[PDB]
Every structure is written in C-alpha cells, then in structure tokens.
Amino acid sequence: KHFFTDGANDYVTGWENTPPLKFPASVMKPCDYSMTKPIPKHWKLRGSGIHGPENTDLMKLVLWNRLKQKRPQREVPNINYLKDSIRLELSVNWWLMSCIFLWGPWLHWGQEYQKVHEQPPWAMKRIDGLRGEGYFTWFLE
Amino acid sequence: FELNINIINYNYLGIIITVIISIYIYNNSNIISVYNSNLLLININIWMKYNILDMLNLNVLDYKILLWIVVIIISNEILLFVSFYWIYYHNYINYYHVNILILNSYNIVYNNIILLTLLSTIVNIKFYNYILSYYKYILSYLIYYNNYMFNNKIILEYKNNSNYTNDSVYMTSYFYIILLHYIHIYDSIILIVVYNYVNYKNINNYYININIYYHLIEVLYIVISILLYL
Amino acid sequence: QVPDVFATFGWERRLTVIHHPGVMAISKLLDQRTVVKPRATFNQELVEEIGDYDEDLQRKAQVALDNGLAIEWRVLDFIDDELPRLLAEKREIEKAREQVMSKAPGDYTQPVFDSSVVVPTPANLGRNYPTLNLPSGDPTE
Amino acid sequence: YKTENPLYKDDEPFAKTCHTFDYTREGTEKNGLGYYCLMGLWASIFIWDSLYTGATMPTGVHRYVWGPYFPTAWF
Amino acid sequence: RIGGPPVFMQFPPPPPKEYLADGTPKTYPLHQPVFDHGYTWEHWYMTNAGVFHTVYYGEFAK
Amino acid sequence: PPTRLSTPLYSEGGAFTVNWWRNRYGLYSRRQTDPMLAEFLFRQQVKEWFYDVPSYNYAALV
Amino acid sequence: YRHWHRMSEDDWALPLDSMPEDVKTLMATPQTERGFVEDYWYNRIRGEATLLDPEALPSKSYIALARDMGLQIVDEPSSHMMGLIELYEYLRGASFVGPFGTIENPVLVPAVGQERVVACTGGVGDEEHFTLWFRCREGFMYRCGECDQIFMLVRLYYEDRYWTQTLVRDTFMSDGDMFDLKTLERVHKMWNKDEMVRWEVGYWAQDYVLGKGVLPGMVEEHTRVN
Amino acid sequence: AYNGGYPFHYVVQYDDPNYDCEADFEFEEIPRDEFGVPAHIPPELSTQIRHTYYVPPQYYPFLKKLGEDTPELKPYTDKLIMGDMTYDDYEEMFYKFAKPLKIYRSRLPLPYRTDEEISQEKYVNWCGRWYSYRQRLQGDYYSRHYF
Amino acid sequence: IYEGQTVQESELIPQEDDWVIEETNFCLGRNCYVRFREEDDLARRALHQMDSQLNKMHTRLRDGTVIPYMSFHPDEMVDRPAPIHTFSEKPLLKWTWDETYEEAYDD
Numbered sequence A: 001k002h003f004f005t006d007g008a009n010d011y012v013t014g015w016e017n018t019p020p021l022k023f024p025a026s027v028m029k030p031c032d033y034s035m036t037k038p039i040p041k042h043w044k045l046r047g048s049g050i051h052g053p054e055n056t057d058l059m060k061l062v063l064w065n066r067l068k069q070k071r072p073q074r075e076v077p078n079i080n081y082l083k084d085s086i087r088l089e090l091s092v093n094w095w096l097m098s099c100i101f102l103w104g105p106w107l108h109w110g111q112e113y114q115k116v117h118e119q120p121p122w123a124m125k126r127i128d129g130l131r132g133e134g135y136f137t138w139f140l141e
Numbered sequence B: 001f002e003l004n005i006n007i008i009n010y011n012y013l014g015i016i017i018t019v020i021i022s023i024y025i026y027n028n029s030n031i032i033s034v035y036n037s038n039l040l041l042i043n044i045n046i047w048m049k050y051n052i053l054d055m056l057n058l059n060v061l062d063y064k065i066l067l068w069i070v071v072i073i074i075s076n077e078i079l080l081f082v083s084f085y086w087i088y089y090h091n092y093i094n095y096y097h098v099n100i101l102i103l104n105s106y107n108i109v110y111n112n113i114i115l116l117t118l119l120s121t122i123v124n125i126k127f128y129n130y131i132l133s134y135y136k137y138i139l140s141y142l143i144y145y146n147n148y149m150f151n152n153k154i155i156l157e158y159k160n161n162s163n164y165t166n167d168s169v170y171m172t173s174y175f176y177i178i179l180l181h182y183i184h185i186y187d188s189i190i191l192i193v194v195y196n197y198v199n200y201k202n203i204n205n206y207y208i209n210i211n212i213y214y215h216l217i218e219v220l221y222i223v224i225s226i227l228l229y230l
Numbered sequence C: 001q002v003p004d005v006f007a008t009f010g011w012e013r014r015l016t017v018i019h020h021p022g023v024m025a026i027s028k029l030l031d032q033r034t035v036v037k038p039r040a041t042f043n044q045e046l047v048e049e050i051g052d053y054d055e056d057l058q059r060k061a062q063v064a065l066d067n068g069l070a071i072e073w074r075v076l077d078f079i080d081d082e083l084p085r086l087l088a089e090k091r092e093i094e095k096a097r098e099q100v101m102s103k104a105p106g107d108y109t110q111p112v113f114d115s116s117v118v119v120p121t122p123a124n125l126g127r128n129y130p131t132l133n134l135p136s137g138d139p140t141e
Numbered sequence D: 001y002k003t004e005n006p007l008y009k010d011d012e013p014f015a016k017t018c019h020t021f022d023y024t025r026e027g028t029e030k031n032g033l034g035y036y037c038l039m040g041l042w043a044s045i046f047i048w049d050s051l052y053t054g055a056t057m058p059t060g061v062h063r064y065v066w067g068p069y070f071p072t073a074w075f
Numbered sequence E: 001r002i003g004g005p006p007v008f009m010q011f012p013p014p015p016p017k018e019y020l021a022d023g024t025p026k027t028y029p030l031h032q033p034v035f036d037h038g039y040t041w042e043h044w045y046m047t048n049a050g051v052f053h054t055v056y057y058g059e060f061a062k
Numbered sequence F: 001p002p003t004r005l006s007t008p009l010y011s012e013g014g015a016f017t018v019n020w021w022r023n024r025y026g027l028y029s030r031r032q033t034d035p036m037l038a039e040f041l042f043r044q045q046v047k048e049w050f051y052d053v054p055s056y057n058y059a060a061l062v
Numbered sequence G: 001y002r003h004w005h006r007m008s009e010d011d012w013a014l015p016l017d018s019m020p021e022d023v024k025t026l027m028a029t030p031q032t033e034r035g036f037v038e039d040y041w042y043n044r045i046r047g048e049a050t051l052l053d054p055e056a057l058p059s060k061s062y063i064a065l066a067r068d069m070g071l072q073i074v075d076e077p078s079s080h081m082m083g084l085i086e087l088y089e090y091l092r093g094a095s096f097v098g099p100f101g102t103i104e105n106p107v108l109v110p111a112v113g114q115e116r117v118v119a120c121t122g123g124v125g126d127e128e129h130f131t132l133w134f135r136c137r138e139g140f141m142y143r144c145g146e147c148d149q150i151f152m153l154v155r156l157y158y159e160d161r162y163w164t165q166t167l168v169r170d171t172f173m174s175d176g177d178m179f180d181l182k183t184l185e186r187v188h189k190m191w192n193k194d195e196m197v198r199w200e201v202g203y204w205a206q207d208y209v210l211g212k213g214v215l216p217g218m219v220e221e222h223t224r225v226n
Numbered sequence H: 001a002y003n004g005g006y007p008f009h010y011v012v013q014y015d016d017p018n019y020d021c022e023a024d025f026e027f028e029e030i031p032r033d034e035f036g037v038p039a040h041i042p043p044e045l046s047t048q049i050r051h052t053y054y055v056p057p058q059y060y061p062f063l064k065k066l067g068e069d070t071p072e073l074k075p076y077t078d079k080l081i082m083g084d085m086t087y088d089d090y091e092e093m094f095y096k097f098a099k100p101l102k103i104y105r106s107r108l109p110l111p112y113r114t115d116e117e118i119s120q121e122k123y124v125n126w127c128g129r130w131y132s133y134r135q136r137l138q139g140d141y142y143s144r145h146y147f
Numbered sequence I: 001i002y003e004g005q006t007v008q009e010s011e012l013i014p015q016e017d018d019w020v021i022e023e024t025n026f027c028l029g030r031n032c033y034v035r036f037r038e039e040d041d042l043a044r045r046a047l048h049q050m051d052s053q054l055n056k057m058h059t060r061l062r063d064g065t066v067i068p069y070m071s072f073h074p075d076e077m078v079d080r081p082a083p084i085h086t087f088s089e090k091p092l093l094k095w096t097w098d099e100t101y102e103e104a105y106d107d
C-alpha cells in the first residue's frame, strides 16, 4: 500500500507487533501473558514487574525486529499481496485502455454524425431553427 | 541514553522569506517581482535542505510527521478548488442562454483526459520502480514531453478563444478554473524536475508526496471536465 | 557447566540480551562467509524449472542431482571438471560425520579423513574460478 | 523433498492473541448482492424514465375489479 | 545512542566571585526596589500549592 | 467493563462493532507495539469513551 | 526498539578500512583504554582467530571462549545494571504500565539525573484517578496523596558516570592473558595461502603487523584515488 | 512480512574480483545472492531450493561438545554436523536460547527512613483508608446538597 | 465516575485504641517574591531560583514517606520560570494493571 500506517503498512521501520507464524511457540511466541496463573504467595517480586524487556516475549520481539532486517533471500509474498501492491497502477492502465478503445471510437462516431446531421446521434433533432451542435450529455438535459 | 528529539535552536530563513514576501508588496517595478521570486525559490530550497539534513537524527516519527502535513496541504488544495466550483455553480442559473460560445465536448476534453492519464501511468511506473529499488531514465523525459504538450495546448486555446473574461461570469469561471488547474500542473513541474534515485529508498518522503500530488491533480481534472466540457 | 553471556547488537544504538556462549560462537562462525558456505540440494521438479531461465544450469544441475551432491552454485558452473573431486569430497564428509556422531560422549578427537578434497579447508582452500559471464557467439550468423 | 511455490501459497492468518484482528463477521470485504441490486435498479430507472416519459403523469381513471379495498388494487 | 544529545548533564561550577579592592562583595543590578513610604502593612493569602498543599503568600507594603 | 485482559470483550457483527473498532484504532498508533500493550490501550479508550453515559447524548445530537 | 530507526550497515559489521593500522599496539591495549572502533577490531581479530582454529575449540573452556570473542560472562551485578539500562531505553518510546506500587515493592522510576517527572493514575478500574503529576527526586519514598501508591527513584549512576553497556563491560570484565601475535600469524597461514584469502581480516591484520604493504596485493588494496 | 519481503540489508556477490557496480558500465556480469544463486534465477524458484550450511569437518568435534554440554542444543548441532541446517533452522536455534535481562530489587538503595519511621507504616496506611472512607461518603453528601 | 479508592472494613481497624488522624501541616510555609541577593551574580541567582521551587517540596509523614507537591497537569512540574529545555528525561505516566509474568518473581 502507498500510505504509511504505523500499525499495518509500517515500511519505514518494518516493526511488527508479533513474531512470524513459522516459529515454534517454544522458539518465539506473541507477547501475551494475560493467561498467567496466579502467583503463589511465597513467591517474591525480584524484578520491577513493569511491562518491558524483562519479559522474555517482549525481549525476543525487540531482538527479532532488529535482526530480521538482514536476510539471505527475499520472502516472496503470494500473488494476492503483489496484486494489492499495484492495484491502482493496474486499474489506471486499464482505464487508459478503455479511454482509447471504448470512449475513443464512439466519440469519433458522434462527431462524424454531427457533421452531417448538425447534432450528435444521441440527441433529439431540433425544429426551433437554432443552429449548432447543442448538448452532448443528453441525460443531463 | 540520548534525548528523544534533537532540538533546533535557531533559524534565519524565516526572516529572509518573510522579507522576500514584503518585497512583492513594497515595490515600484514588476522586474523586481520577477527577481524576488527567484530569491523565494532559493530560500525555500534551503529549507528543504534542512529537512534532508534532519535525516541524521534517525528519528522514526519524522516520516510520519511530514506525511501528515502533506495530507493537510492536499486537503487545502482540494478545498480551494471546491471554492471555485462553488463560485461556478452559484451563478449556474445564468448560464447556457447567454450569447457566448461555450467549449466543445469532443476535442479538448478527450485529448486532455488521454494526456493526463498517460502522465498518471508514468508516475505509477516511477512508484513501481521505487518499490523495486530500480530506475528507468526515460521516465522523467516522458513527463517533460507531456508537460510540454499540455502547455502548448493550453496556450493556443486561450489565444484562440473568442470570449473574454469580461464577457460573462461563465467565461471568468471557465478561465479561472482552468488557470488554477494549470498552476497546480506547473507546481508539479517544480517538484518533478529533481526526481532522482536515492539509496535510502522508502524513508524518503519525496517519493510518496509526488505520487499523491500527481494523482490529486489528475483527479481534479476529471471533476473540471465534467463540470465545464461535458 | 555453560555460563551465560551478554550478546549485544548494533553499532551506535546497542541492544543487549543474554544468550548461550556456544550459540553465539556458531553465529559468528556462520558469519565467516568465506569459510562456512551454503550449499544447494536439488530435486527433479526444481531442476526442470531451472531450464526455463538458464538451459546450461539445468544440465549442470541435473548432474548434481543424479549424484546427490550438495553443491555451491559457483562450483556448479564447473561441475564438468570438478565432478571427480566432488564425489570424493562427498565420501570424506560422510565418513567424518559418521565418525564424530558414533564417538562416545566426551570424545572430541578430530575425525580421520582426506581433507585435501574438501573445500574450504586448510588442506585445500579452493580454486580461482574464472568468470563465465563472457559472450562467445557471433550475433550475425 | 517437496516444496510449494510461494506465489501460490495462501495468505497468512492474523495472530491469535489478546489483541486479535477479525474481519470475518464485518461483511465489508466485497460488494454484495444488494449493491448489485442497486446498480440494476439504477439502470432500470434510467431506461424507464426515458422509455416511458408519461409515467409521472398517470391517469386518474381507475376501474379496479373487486373495488379499491382489494390488495391487487394497490399495485 | 552513543554520542547523541545527553539526556542529563551536570551544571559546571559558577564563575569566580568578584570582590572589590577593599574586599566588599561586588553587587550587581537588582530590580527589586525597597520603595520609600510610611506604609508597613502585610497581607497574607492562602494559596493553592498543587493538589494537597498550600502556601501562605505574603505581600509587603515596602 | 472487564479489568482483566484474559476476559474477552463481546462484539456484534457488522461495520461498527468492538471488533471493527479494534482493527482500525491502532492503524496510525505508535504506542500499540505489542499485543498486551495494544489491548490495554484499546480497552482504555473504549472504557473512557463508549462506557461514558453522557457521551451518548452527543451522539444523538450529531 | 520500536522507537529506533532502521539498522545501518555498520550495525552489522565495520569496513576493514576502519581497522587501526597499528595492530601490534591494538592487541596490547587494555580494555579500559580502547575506544569503540579499537574495541570492535580487538574483539573481531581475537575472536575470529580462536574461531578459525577448529582443532583447539573443543579443549577451550566456555570462560576462555567467551573471553576470546569478547562476550561478558553475566553475573547478578552486571545483569541488574544491563537490565535497568534496557528498561530505561524501552521507556523512551513506550508506555509505563505495571503493578500497583507498595512500600515492599515501590514503583521503580529509572533516571540518569536526580529527578524525573512522574504521574500517578491510581489503581485499576474504579481505583484509577486523574493524572497527578509530581517530581520524583532521589532519596525520598514518595506516596501519592490520593491512592497512597508508593514510588521510588532508581538512579543509573556509577563512579561519576551513568550506566552504559560500555561502562558495565569495563567495570566487570577482566582482561585475560595478553593476545599472542603468533596465533594471528598461525591462523593467517591456515586460511590464507597461494592467493586465496579465507580470513580477510587476518590478512589485513598480518599486513599491518608486518608494516603495511608487505603481503601480496596489499599495496594495491591500500592505493585509493579519492 | 515487512517491506514486501525485501530485506533491508542483503549480501551480493560478483564473479569478477575487480568488478565495481558503480565504475563499470558493462552488460554481461550477473550478480549472485548470499547463497550464490545467480540473479537470473527468480526468487520464487531459488527460495524453494534447499540450502544448508556446510562447516569444515574439523569443526564437527566442537559442535559435538556443544550438544553434549547443552542437550537442548543437541538437535540443532546435529543438523549442522549432518549438513541439514537451513537458515530457518539457525534462526530457531538463535532465538530459542535468548534470555531476558534480570533486575534485582534487593540491590536497589532505599530512601533513608529511620527505624522509628519504619514502625509507623501500618498507622499511615490506616490513616489513608479513613481518608478515603471520609472522601467517598462526603461525595454523596455534597452531591445531594448542591444539586 | 471517580469516588475515591474502595475501603474494606478490615482496613479501618486500628492497632491501638489511641490512634487518631495525623495532624501534619500541609501548608508548605510563608512565601513571597523570590528575593535575590545583590551580591549574587547571574549564575548564583539562577541557583537561588532553583532552590525556591515549590514543586520540589513535600510533606514527610509519620512513617517516613513524603507526599509531594502534585498537580493535575504537567505544566506545574517545570522549574518556574520555565527553562529553555524542560523534559529532557521523558516524564513517565504510570498506568496500573493486574497482569503479571513469571520471570519477575523468584521462588
């Protein structure tokens, strides 16, 4: 996508909130400890307890988000992604084709008809005696 | 540990640019105004250099900040055109029955729409290459040819038009809307003349800005064509 | 007993984590691109697809596949001449792998093999391969 | 070994976490039948308004078998 | 970030104090006048000093 | 309004729901950098703006 | 971190043209006296010299192996400092959310100076109150006037310096046996022979020990045009 | 899943030892990737080909020692010895053995408080609860009076 | 709406029958215009101003904890008058939640 979005289309830094799905959960998992079981009372708080790099998952997320920036080969995206990347480009190109091979031919026919019959082929011939081509978009009359 | 932001403490371009603006008002010669415009260009370019040199701070939020500024600016460009469309339609009740010759709906609209579409395709190819870390030299010169033809066609139209600005508010609105589009076309030339391949690639705000602006101008011409020619 | 170590990444902006000393040693060893080399293994399906882009590589890749060789791409360009050495190299690597794997725990003696045919090794540091990116055909024929 | 061409693999799913993205129930992925019914009606109104230009000026004369209070006398 | 604008820096010590030749401390301009008149009233006002504190602010006639 | 991230939030299906809002709230956000933090900030905003009774009066007026 | 921009090329490795030309003195300099560039190339030369000698690795202890590669064996003192450093850096561009602070376990507020502005939002749910900002100065156990949440300032200060990865490495790492240049030469001949250089860093390093320009092709390597 | 799959940084190799992509303007040299794949073989095809790291056999005894001292590390070292470790396998090994830095609260110096003051902690907490009780009740009382 | 922290009756039970509410004065003191000495130069008058900041003051309770000068907004947290560079170390807004992870604890 063209526009940059911190959450989804973050191409400036390449940050990703979660690790790749390819990695086993034992190797790397999304940072989610909402399901942690209640802490036993005899356990004592050693660390700060503050959300941050003391948590293993968050640490691995930061580490991977920096070490993923160098890779031996490309991670080929599927054709669906590639189509979306240039959706506007392809659509504009087809619009140009339509303007040349659809709009072009009937516009030429209308002008040639206008030459002989004074008004385009999609207009009501007048009887008022006024001269000239008149309107072109008949449905906006 | 470093500070989150590398504060800029002093700047002197602002004084110069503001004085340059005053010269436009406090002058007795139109030649002074021409040379003053060059001074403006120079100092606006210095400000752009300051933006490029701010890259040394390695601040992630800089791209986002500039991108959103462009969004606001584009919005202001769209709303200025809206004001002209408003001026045009307010007097719609006095159009089409006056003894003036309005524009044809066959020649100008088609060649212009076909031309501006090709301009979009070139910019789109530039974006595609930008994505692929590639460059094609001929692309920019195709833009120059397109701009040349656009300028050649608009000049002849105005010179061969048989109705003047003082003939009717219809004619005034037609000329003004077309001129406003042309000015935005010329601003596109101002931006595109510096297009080159930079190796920092997608952290360069220039590329996204050009793509957005060119699309805006072409889309704006679709609205104009429907209102005036068709 | 394996001590923990600090592993830091980045030059100006440095991120520090805890890591395994052996895992870090392997990581730096694999960074010696001239010593530790990636090698390609083919299958018949992929060899056929190569011909769609380089006919010569398809023929050479077929030879590597037929002999079950894990081969570097640069060597693959000279497989016609290197084949006898590559077959000898395959045997020696297999012998060494077997010897080290079968050895009892705590036995870290070097394997007995002919290193003169294994590249890159001190005994055979390789050949200066000439570039083959030279046209040899006359366009007017 | 066997492999899959990456160009024809399926899109990766959103990660399942406390913060999960789900578009399945929105129904905003593509234009539905209703949208195409709007297009059909637009085409129909466009053709009808031009073919039958006296429809907006109907005739007040009405017979209506079974009188006016029968259901087929309201359409 | 190594070699970037420091988050915190300690103030350097102030420049040496200046005495007059006779040893009198050199005084510097000060815009806190002691106005001359016969009024000596002192008005005190309880003032907001945040959320949980106050300060007894006094205004002196002089 | 739940206070534990383990307890899910109910969402209807459609184009204006809790799930629809979650997908788009953090699109431009630099602060929602991981699931735990993203959900906490999302629920913080939802609690503050959508569980505020008087806010619904303005929805009617607009 | 999310607030950092994209890795530079230097973040992975340094160009060999940044290697100090006086290698003999570089390998004899104490760690406390080595700069960033000097320390990078001391570790790389010594670390790759041991890693490119396979026959000696199995008999080398992890303590000795870590020293050669320049990796610091972790301990509670250094772990504490490094951890608080990384927590400070994370909080530069991340939210500050954690458990409710009490006398037993105050909210830890890392700072380099003697003060940091902090806001208390209270507890969770209905116990959350409006932001109450206060200046957290060192040496005082702060108590919110509203929810009684206890706060405390933690200073990253050591011997007239703040805590950095470089400071932690200098204070706790101990230089081992002086690096022997014979090992550099021995490994150099192992992987570099007959115009094949499979240890480029050791070919450049040996050239400098020889005086710069001695080894084949090195004069041509050092001759630049601009 | 970032930047369209294009790595921000990647290795390129050239067959000619004196080749310079900036000085030369020839049109015959074909660049290779980090694994050595020529550029004319598309990514979709080369990424399917299986590439494994080959270390010199003199390293096998060292890789064996690592596996024995850390049994959890043995399966990865065995793959490396047998030439079955791909880049993905290496990444899994790397992130599996990364641990977070630990902070010890017992090492934090505390703000100075006398032993007399430390014995009054329960009293101060007691005062705080009564202040919150009186605050909450007054809110109801005042709301009723003024409204 | 916010109505204070919730209190359980058990927490309102004293450990002595003589406990009453501590009568500590939260008026910081008597103040006026900061009065600079003539002898002090610009540098030493800056030090004087920095030592007269009300937002650096607090009240110490009977147990040794101090309730600081607090404000609803961070505008009252900078030195008065405002220095050129104020928030060099990013002010930390502390949020509270019930989530926890095992790594923080030790058995």
Ligand SMILES: CCCCCCCC/C=C/CCCCCCCC(=O)OC[C@H](COP(=O)(O)OCCN)OC(=O)CCCCCCC/C=C/CCCCCCCC
Binding pocket: A100, A101, A103, A104, A105, A106, A107, A108, A109, A111, B106, B107, B110
């Ligand atoms: C057994 C089944 C057989 C079916 C056979 C189907 C045959 C269909 C043939 C369709 C022919 C259409 C021809 C259209 C010609 C238009 C020419 C024209 O107008 O040229 C000029 C015009 C521009 O004129 P201006 O002067 O600028 O004026 C307008 C703008 N101011 O140029 C254009 O429009 C350019 C585009 C031309 C398009 C030509 C299209 C030709 C299509 C052929 C289709 C053949 C299909 C065969 C199917 C066979 C199946 C067995």
Ligand SMILES: CCCCCCCCCCCCCCCC(=O)OC[C@H](COP(=O)(O)O)OC(=O)CCCCCCCCCCCCCCC
Binding pocket: D027, D030, D031, D032, D033, D034, D035, D036, D037, D038, D041
């Ligand atoms: C600022 C001005 C903007 C431009 C002008 C705005 C005009 C008003 C807003 C229109 C916006 C439409 C956007 C497109 C939405 C869309 O396609 O929305 C599509 C939806 C269907 O959604 P799906 O795609 O999910 O099926 O269409 C419908 O809900 C209608 C289905 C077809 C109904 C056919 C029969 C209709 C009968 C109508 C009778 C009317 C009688 C009136 C008597 C007085």
Ligand SMILES: CCCCCCCCCCCCCCCC(=O)OC[C@H](COP(=O)(O)O)OC(=O)CCCCCCCCCCCCCCC
Binding pocket: F060, F061
């Ligand atoms: C910001 C908070 C906003 C809250 C919402 C405010 C809505 C206020 C609506 C008031 C409508 C009153 C007039 C009704 C029309 C009338 O008397 O109108 C009177 C006329 C003529 O009546 P008679 O001919 O019988 O005298 O009625 C008609 O001809 C038909 C009227 C149909 C009305 C349908 C459209 C309105 C539907 C409103 C639904 C919600 C009502 C809510 C009420 C509180």
Ligand SMILES: [Zn+2]
Binding pocket: G120, G121, G122, G123, G129, G132, G144, G145, G146, G147, G148, G149
């Ligand atoms: Zn509080």
